[PDB]
Amino acid sequence: QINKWQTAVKSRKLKTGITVELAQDLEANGFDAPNFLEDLLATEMADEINKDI
Amino acid sequence: RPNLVALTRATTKLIYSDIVATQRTNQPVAAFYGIKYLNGATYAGEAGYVDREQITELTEESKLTLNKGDLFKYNNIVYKVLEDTPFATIEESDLELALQIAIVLLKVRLFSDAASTSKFESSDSEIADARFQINKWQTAVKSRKLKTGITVELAQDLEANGFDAPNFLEDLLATEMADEINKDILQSLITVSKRYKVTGITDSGFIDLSYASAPEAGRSLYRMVCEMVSHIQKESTYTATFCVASARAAAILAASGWLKHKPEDDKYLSQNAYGFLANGLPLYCDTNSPLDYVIVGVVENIGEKEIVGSIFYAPYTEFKVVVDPESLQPSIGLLVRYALSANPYTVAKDEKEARIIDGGDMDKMAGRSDLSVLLGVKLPK
Amino acid sequence: RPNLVALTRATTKLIYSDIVATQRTNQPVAAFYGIKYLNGATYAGEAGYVDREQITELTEESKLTLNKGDLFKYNNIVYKVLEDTPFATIEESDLELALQIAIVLLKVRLFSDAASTSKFESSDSEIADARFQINKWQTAVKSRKLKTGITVELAQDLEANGFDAPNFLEDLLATEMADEINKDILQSLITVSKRYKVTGITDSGFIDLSYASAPEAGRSLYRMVCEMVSHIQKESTYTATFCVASARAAAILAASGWLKHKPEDDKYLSQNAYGFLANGLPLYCDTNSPLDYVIVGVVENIGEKEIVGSIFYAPYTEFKVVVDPESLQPSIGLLVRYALSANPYTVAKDEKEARIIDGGDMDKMAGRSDLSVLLGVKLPK
Amino acid sequence: FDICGVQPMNSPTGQVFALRAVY
């Protein structure tokens, strides 16, 4: 038989891209930092997601 | 300087550039970056943390007072209770195992805090903190120099061998430089690598396969090495990426059946690999250190940046070659400089300690890698 | 002579051209070159040597009088002391092992002399000297000749087989010549290779797998052969690049799962190899020498030049085939000339000894390769 | 603002040069 069901879309959220003096550090690392940090944040998110799975 | 560019690019091909993180500088010091953190499961959120504290530490005295629908935590993992009095039927006295069992038997359930949109927006809740923390440090670029290009009577020999000699000599001198750089890296890796330790060091002493112990096949070392990978996996969000060992420690020892001697090399291995293990990560070999050790560890990147490594390397160019023709001796000098370091924050609680240390100071970084471990090995010598 | 160029190129394909280093000549002698160093660790500079001399020889009576921050050296390796009185807690009486223990326990640290340029220029210090020297020598070109392409009644037979007989006979003669050349090379490799020896030869006598000893599987030979590779790695800056053995010694004996039968004839293997070991290296099969031995060693290059090898080959071209119509038998003669030699420097301290010896003198070069080792094997005959 | 060398950095650490006497 083919079944169907529905469930809520659930989520997780991070405040982890810390900036301030960190912005200054990221500016020092400004050659990569804009994207680098988003990619990094995405990576830790992916990690928890994989674990949730 | 195009000649430094050509010599460097054509010579660093000879060093283990992949068993360290590669970064670069253009400064007298290298600005190195990297990631470390304290734990590895579920969320890093404060609200969730408080919830853990607000449910139970799961002391054995309380594990049976829990009932269906309850949450509990242990070692920062939240688990939910299935049916009443979880663990009532588990004879195990050590909660770590009783929990392991309870999860298997579905007495408890690993708890997911994935949640509805409502949970978050309704409570106008907090949000998860970083699992990771990112560091930066500045390590001086050190030089190492050679006065190895001996020419004089040798110049005449080089003229006799003039077919190849001009570059042949520089390439050779550069080769010796690569050797020293590689050795320098390896000493740092050896030093920083955490001692792999289990029950008082790898089953209550450094693994010993000597004649006074277990001159077996080498199988027991392969088992220990594979466990070193486990250690990396348990401690960090990475699997081991590479392994280096002495010739006696593994290049030959594992020849017994736990090592493939580079049957392929246009895929997955570096050109300087010996080969790879049966539970392989490219296997490199130092050949110098008296330790006859094994190192297992990990380098990793975010896009182009190798933010992860136990040791980081950052060369500074403006492989420089010079000539000093005193008398009849137009000899060749070779100068190379780079910063080499470990993430200094692995030995610091905060910036007031990190700022007074140096990732390049291998006296302080000794045994504090966490992205690598080293195994001492007693061999059947 | 384009026809000879073609015969040479089309015939030397049949000799173990890669288990020797290949160079070439155009002179009556071949000018051969090679690389050597006497000790491997750290810098080879005088400044370094002096600093080492100025700290300690690590006498076992002094090993524990050292404290945090001190340097010491042992067997030319410089180490720094971590915490006080290193070795105070090490019961080991054999200093070599006590040091290995101290390194793994982080009582001592492998030390690098790398430093800021300021250190070097301020000091106006010395610089690392060469580790390896390049030596040149000249060895006479020698030859072998066949007068075997028999014709007469045979010419009639060749005419009967005129379809392709002209070249056939030359190709066959060339093949037999290649075989003899290869034999000459193998005898030289056998001779020059150092006798592998551990504790009085391969664990106090040559490996013996005879029926009165260990007619096992051949596993024990593989192990010793593999150990020979570790020796190559230990005593040089190269990994083994080839292996050759008789059939009984290993091409067949190790074919119990420790040897691969050329499953691919173009992957990490020459066309003349019998196969490659389970642990790599193309394996060549001698088949003629009564020795029933196994050789492990290296051939290596800097750019295009095969500068490293135990044996060097340098053919002299300008495979000459001629017909001599003597009597009624205009047979085909074939001559091949080449220099074959070992690096004479391995039996000399300096040029005043090198100038009275010959790399082609196998009565002196015997056992002095250092880039190869031979294992005598007693077989289950 | 103008009684010092400036030698503006393009990276922290980062450095300045000085014509220090040999002394």
Tokens of C54: 């100025």
Q: Do chains C and B have 3 or more beta-carbon pairs under 8 angstroms?
A: yes
- Alpha-carbon gap, residue B181 to B187, rounded angstroms: 10
Peptide bond into D14 cis (omega under 30): yes
Three-state secondary structure string covering C291-305: CCCEEEECCEEECCE
**How far, in Å, CA of C225 to CA of C245, rounded?**
10
Minimal CA separation from A18 to chain B, in Å: 9
End-to-end Cα spacing for chain D? 28
Do B127 and A14 lie within an 8 Å CB cutoff? Answer: yes
Rounded Cα distance between C98 and B306, Å, is: 37
- What is the secondary structure of C221-285 as a DSSP string? HHHHHHHHHHHHHHHSSS---EEEE-IIIIITTTTTTSEE--SSSSSS--TT-SEEETTEEEEEE
The two structure tokens encoding residue B71: 């949450």
Token code pair at residue C145: 């000749």
Domains of chain C: 1-39+126-193+299-364 (no CATH), 53-113 (2.10.10.40), 194-298+366-381 (3.30.2320.40)
Cα distance from A34 to chain B (closest Cα, Å)?
Answer: 12
Chain centre distance of CA C180: 21
Interface residue D13 vs chain B (CB under 8 A): yes
Angle at B304 between CA B299 and CA B308, to 5 degrees: 25
Q: What is the dihedral of CA C142, C148, C151, C157, to 10 degrees?
A: -130
Cα–Cα nearest to C201, from C369, C376, C366, C378 = C376
- D8 inside 8 A of chain B by CB: no
Nearest to C304 by CA among C33, C12, C3, C28: C33
H or E stretch at B237: none
Determine contact: B140 vs chain D, CB below 8 A.
no
Which residue in chain C has the smallest CA separation from B289? Answer: C41
What lies within 8 Å, CB to CB, of C76 at 6+ separation is C39, C41, C42, C52
Angstrom distance (rounded) from CA C321 to CA C316: 15
Which positions 109-138 of B are in contact with D (Cβ < 8 Å)?
Answer: 138
Please judge whether B171 and C280 are an interchain contact, meaning their C-beta atoms are less than 8 angstroms apart: no
Q: Is C45 helix (H, G, I), strand (E, B) or coil?
A: strand
Cβ partners under 8 Å of residue C100, min gap 6:
B290, B291, B292, B376
D14 vs B: CB within 8 A:
yes
If you write DSSP's letter for every residue of C287-355 in order, what string do you get? -S-TT--EEEE--EEETTEEEE-SEEEEEB---EEEEEEETTEEEEEEEEEEEEEE-GGGG-SSHHHHT
Task: Read off the tokens for B349.
Answer: 């609680």
Resolution in units of Å: 5.1
Residue with tokens 């300045």: D16
Distances from the Cα of C263 to the Cα of B225, C269, C285, D6, angstroms: 30, 10, 16, 68
Q: Does D15 touch chain B (CB under 8 A)?
A: yes
| Alpha carbon of C104: minimum distance to chain B alpha carbons (Å) | 6
> Closest by alpha carbon to B43, among B81, B78, B79?
B78
Residues 26 through 45 of chain B touching chain D, CB cutoff 8 Å: 26-29, 31
